[PDB]
Symmetry: C7
Subunit: 75 residues, 7 copies
């Protein structure tokens, strides 16, 4: 999309499964349902991963953008 | 429906707050602001899934929050 | 909305201030700004629930606060 | 005299190297970026001391965690 | 003190000895000479402390507010 | 120079070799090509050192000022 | 009446000691500084345990790392 609008890539993932990598190495998987300029975001049917192992099924969750390291598409 | 707008849909509901450093909280959300500072009623701290201290009503600065989820009353 | 506008209700009441690092304070909230910087009279710095120091009047920077709860 | 973020502009659609705090490393084609250096990479790959550790495809990296960005091969 | 003006209490400690706690469990004592909006301070006759005992004499020093955890005056 | 414009010093190093010292102690050396008010900067023919021994040659690189502790002449 | 940043101004061109987070320490002549306290030292020297460890000549220090500034030497 716009080379000045990197958050659009997030819009290109609305209702899709994403992978949230947090500072401290924590990982989160779920369906992106929204986000804002601060990258705060809402995940649906989100699950907390550890070394690739689900360790917590939270359901819907709001993640503060400040903690995010990266967001990538996943299955 | 921007992220914070979700918190509104949880006002007066039991939520679970996860803080930096792996500290966790549980209580009924009564208010919040854009910075995600928030007030919890009948709150209580948790460690490894077991309550460690009941703090009743408490104000949490959003800066320390990692995520917030839906919870249940016991 | 009103988290801040709910701290005022404790103005002149005993509060507990938990900080990053687990250091905690107890005392009478006397004033605060929107950044959560606040003043405590008859303050006490605690550890493990044990009074570590009697500070009297103290100004704490909000930036180090984790949470504040209504004391007793 | 192009300031810091222009040199970034000259790498648009070129492979780059992003080095994060905590020493984690990434490689991928730079697709976009903002003033905060929040950026997007396509064909992204995370590295383990010069050894590919994970293929991420398209990824959005928050600038705050970045240390430096270098040109790629 | 004004319920919305915490820094006021700093104004009340001017030219009065104070205790400054910094991030990293470090401490300093001295006489408050000036402070600004960000809690940057200037202490006269300052001293760094550790375990309650002096670690170093610094004289006049300018402390950046950001490193401050809390500022204590006395107790009356 | 201007006792009010410390970044003027950076201006004086444009196209000269500098030593960038980062948080965590990492260290970079290269030729300063440009910078902004946040001290974000570009270096040509840059190299990452370790205890005085270059351990990586990055050529042109963009360093976020945020990680910088200090910058010296080389 | 004096304000921190202005008092700093009182030390332009005199020796000052800059103490940083991590406990690294530098000494040199204050040559310039802005509101963020990013500043410049001429004849700068980093110390460790109280003994010079390296002479860095002119150096630009980011205020963000600064804990305190004191009149030294
Ligand atoms: Cl929620
Ligand atoms: Cl001074």
């Amino acid at each position: 999309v716009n080379v000045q609008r990197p958050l659009d890539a997030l819009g290109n993932s609305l209702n899709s499964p994403v992978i949230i990598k947090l500072k401290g190495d924590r990982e989160f998987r779920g369906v992106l349902k929204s986000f804002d300029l601060h990258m705060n975001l809402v995940l649906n049917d989100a699950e907390e991963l550890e070394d690739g192992e689900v360790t917590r099924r939270l359901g819907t969750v709001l993640i503060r953008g400040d903690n995010i390291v990266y967001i990538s598409r996943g299955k």
